[PDB]
Amino acid sequence: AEVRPPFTYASLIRQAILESPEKQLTLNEIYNWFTRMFPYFRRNAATWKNAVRHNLSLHKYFVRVENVKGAVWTVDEVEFQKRRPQK
């Protein structure tokens, strides 16, 4: 019953965010999904939350649109694709 292997979270973070229409979502909503979908986050949450925070500020494709319901994290295919030479 090994757990899924670690990889580029940029694909998992954009996914939870992609769950929205404008591709914008808060971290709290992504965290619930992280543990809710994968129980492998119900223990070491001090290391992943630390990398996401650092990668978030350094990631320019991650923008926080301040909203009345709280700012949300959104990814722009322009910035994200600006550094995604997948072809």
Coordinates of N, CA and C in Angstrom, one line a residue:
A1 N 0.9 -1.2 0.0 CA 0.0 0.0 0.0 C 0.9 1.3 0.0
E2 N 2.0 1.2 -0.7 CA 2.9 2.4 -0.8 C 2.0 3.7 -1.1
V3 N 2.5 4.8 -0.8 CA 1.8 6.1 -1.2 C 2.3 6.6 -2.5
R4 N 1.5 7.4 -3.1 CA 1.9 8.0 -4.4 C 3.3 8.7 -4.3
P5 N 4.1 8.7 -5.3 CA 5.4 9.3 -5.4 C 5.3 10.8 -5.5
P6 N 6.3 11.5 -4.9 CA 6.4 12.9 -5.0 C 6.8 13.4 -6.3
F7 N 6.4 14.6 -6.8 CA 6.8 15.1 -8.1 C 6.5 16.6 -8.1
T8 N 6.4 17.2 -9.3 CA 6.2 18.6 -9.4 C 4.8 19.0 -8.9
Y9 N 4.7 19.6 -7.7 CA 3.4 20.0 -7.1 C 2.7 21.0 -8.0
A10 N 3.5 21.7 -8.8 CA 2.9 22.8 -9.7 C 1.7 22.2 -10.5
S11 N 1.7 20.9 -10.7 CA 0.6 20.3 -11.4 C -0.6 20.0 -10.4
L12 N -0.3 19.7 -9.2 CA -1.3 19.4 -8.2 C -1.9 20.7 -7.7
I13 N -1.1 21.7 -7.5 CA -1.6 23.0 -7.0 C -2.5 23.6 -8.1
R14 N -2.0 23.6 -9.3 CA -2.9 24.2 -10.4 C -4.2 23.4 -10.5
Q15 N -4.1 22.2 -10.3 CA -5.4 21.3 -10.3 C -6.4 21.8 -9.3
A16 N -6.1 21.8 -8.0 CA -7.0 22.3 -7.0 C -7.5 23.7 -7.4
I17 N -6.6 24.5 -7.9 CA -7.0 25.9 -8.3 C -7.9 25.8 -9.6
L18 N -7.5 24.9 -10.5 CA -8.3 24.8 -11.7 C -9.7 24.4 -11.3
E19 N -9.9 23.9 -10.1 CA -11.3 23.6 -9.7 C -12.2 24.8 -9.8
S20 N -11.6 26.0 -9.8 CA -12.5 27.2 -9.9 C -12.6 27.6 -11.4
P21 N -13.5 28.5 -11.6 CA -13.7 29.0 -13.0 C -12.6 30.0 -13.5
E22 N -12.2 30.9 -12.6 CA -11.1 31.8 -13.0 C -9.8 31.2 -12.6
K23 N -9.8 30.0 -12.2 CA -8.5 29.3 -11.8 C -7.9 30.0 -10.6
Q24 N -8.7 30.4 -9.7 CA -8.3 31.1 -8.5 C -8.8 30.4 -7.2
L25 N -7.9 30.0 -6.3 CA -8.5 29.3 -5.1 C -7.6 29.6 -3.9
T26 N -8.1 29.7 -2.7 CA -7.3 30.0 -1.5 C -6.5 28.7 -1.1
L27 N -5.5 28.9 -0.2 CA -4.7 27.7 0.2 C -5.6 26.8 1.1
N28 N -6.3 27.4 2.0 CA -7.2 26.6 2.9 C -8.0 25.6 2.1
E29 N -8.7 26.0 1.1 CA -9.5 25.1 0.3 C -8.6 24.0 -0.3
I30 N -7.4 24.4 -0.7 CA -6.5 23.4 -1.4 C -6.0 22.4 -0.3
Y31 N -5.7 22.9 0.9 CA -5.2 22.0 2.0 C -6.3 21.0 2.3
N32 N -7.5 21.4 2.5 CA -8.6 20.4 2.8 C -8.5 19.3 1.7
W33 N -8.5 19.7 0.5 CA -8.5 18.7 -0.6 C -7.2 17.9 -0.5
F34 N -6.1 18.5 -0.2 CA -4.8 17.8 -0.1 C -5.0 16.6 0.9
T35 N -5.4 16.8 2.1 CA -5.5 15.7 3.1 C -6.8 14.9 2.8
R36 N -7.9 15.6 2.5 CA -9.2 14.9 2.2 C -8.9 13.8 1.1
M37 N -8.4 14.2 0.0 CA -8.1 13.2 -1.1 C -6.9 12.3 -0.7
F38 N -5.9 12.9 -0.2 CA -4.7 12.0 0.2 C -4.4 12.1 1.7
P39 N -4.5 11.0 2.4 CA -4.3 11.0 3.8 C -2.8 11.1 4.2
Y40 N -2.0 11.1 3.2 CA -0.5 11.1 3.4 C -0.1 12.5 3.9
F41 N -1.1 13.4 4.0 CA -0.8 14.8 4.5 C -1.3 15.0 5.9
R42 N -1.8 13.9 6.5 CA -2.4 14.1 7.9 C -1.3 13.8 8.9
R43 N -0.1 14.0 8.5 CA 1.1 13.8 9.5 C 2.1 14.8 9.3
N44 N 2.9 14.7 8.2 CA 4.0 15.7 8.0 C 3.4 16.9 7.2
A45 N 2.8 17.9 7.8 CA 2.2 19.0 7.1 C 3.1 20.3 7.4
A46 N 4.2 20.1 8.0 CA 5.1 21.2 8.3 C 6.1 21.3 7.2
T47 N 6.3 20.3 6.5 CA 7.3 20.3 5.4 C 6.7 20.7 4.0
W48 N 5.5 20.1 3.7 CA 4.8 20.5 2.5 C 4.3 21.9 2.5
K49 N 3.7 22.3 3.6 CA 3.2 23.7 3.7 C 4.3 24.7 3.6
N50 N 5.5 24.3 4.0 CA 6.7 25.2 4.0 C 7.1 25.3 2.5
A51 N 7.2 24.2 1.8 CA 7.7 24.3 0.4 C 6.7 25.1 -0.4
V52 N 5.4 24.8 -0.3 CA 4.4 25.5 -1.0 C 4.5 27.0 -0.8
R53 N 4.6 27.4 0.5 CA 4.7 28.9 0.8 C 5.9 29.5 0.0
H54 N 7.1 28.8 0.1 CA 8.3 29.4 -0.6 C 8.0 29.3 -2.1
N55 N 7.6 28.2 -2.6 CA 7.4 28.1 -4.1 C 6.3 29.1 -4.5
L56 N 5.3 29.4 -3.7 CA 4.3 30.3 -4.0 C 4.8 31.7 -4.2
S57 N 5.5 32.3 -3.2 CA 6.1 33.6 -3.4 C 7.0 33.7 -4.6
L58 N 7.8 32.7 -4.7 CA 8.8 32.6 -5.8 C 8.1 32.4 -7.2
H59 N 7.0 31.7 -7.1 CA 6.3 31.4 -8.4 C 5.5 32.7 -8.8
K60 N 5.9 33.2 -10.0 CA 5.2 34.5 -10.4 C 3.9 34.1 -11.1
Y61 N 3.7 32.9 -11.5 CA 2.4 32.5 -12.2 C 1.4 32.4 -11.1
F62 N 1.7 32.5 -9.9 CA 0.7 32.3 -8.8 C 0.3 33.8 -8.4
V63 N -0.9 34.1 -8.6 CA -1.4 35.5 -8.2 C -2.5 35.4 -7.2
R64 N -2.5 36.4 -6.3 CA -3.6 36.4 -5.2 C -4.6 37.5 -5.5
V65 N -5.7 37.1 -6.0 CA -6.8 38.2 -6.3 C -7.6 38.5 -5.1
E66 N -7.3 39.6 -4.4 CA -8.1 39.9 -3.2 C -9.5 39.9 -3.5
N67 N -10.3 39.2 -2.7 CA -11.8 39.1 -3.0 C -12.6 39.4 -1.7
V68 N -13.8 39.7 -1.8 CA -14.6 40.0 -0.6 C -14.6 38.7 0.3
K69 N -14.6 37.6 -0.3 CA -14.6 36.3 0.5 C -13.2 35.9 0.8
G70 N -12.2 36.8 0.6 CA -10.8 36.5 1.0 C -10.0 36.3 -0.3
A71 N -8.8 36.7 -0.3 CA -7.9 36.6 -1.5 C -7.8 35.1 -2.0
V72 N -7.7 34.8 -3.2 CA -7.6 33.4 -3.7 C -6.4 33.2 -4.5
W73 N -5.8 32.1 -4.5 CA -4.6 31.8 -5.3 C -4.9 31.4 -6.7
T74 N -4.4 32.1 -7.7 CA -4.8 31.7 -9.1 C -3.5 31.6 -10.0
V75 N -3.6 30.7 -11.0 CA -2.4 30.5 -11.9 C -2.7 31.0 -13.2
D76 N -1.8 31.7 -13.8 CA -2.1 32.3 -15.2 C -1.3 31.4 -16.2
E77 N -2.1 30.8 -17.1 CA -1.4 30.0 -18.2 C -0.3 30.8 -18.9
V78 N -0.5 32.1 -18.9 CA 0.6 33.0 -19.5 C 1.9 32.8 -18.8
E79 N 1.9 33.1 -17.5 CA 3.1 33.0 -16.7 C 3.5 31.5 -16.5
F80 N 2.5 30.7 -16.2 CA 2.8 29.2 -16.1 C 3.4 28.7 -17.4
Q81 N 2.7 29.0 -18.5 CA 3.2 28.5 -19.8 C 4.5 29.3 -20.2
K82 N 4.7 30.5 -19.6 CA 5.9 31.3 -20.0 C 7.1 30.5 -19.6
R83 N 7.0 29.6 -18.7 CA 8.2 28.8 -18.3 C 7.9 27.3 -18.4
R84 N 7.0 26.9 -19.3 CA 6.7 25.5 -19.4 C 6.9 25.0 -20.9
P85 N 8.2 24.7 -21.2 CA 8.6 24.2 -22.5 C 8.2 22.7 -22.7
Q86 N 7.0 22.4 -22.6 CA 6.6 21.0 -22.7 C 6.6 20.6 -24.2
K87 N 6.9 21.5 -25.1 CA 6.9 21.2 -26.5 C 7.4 22.4 -27.3

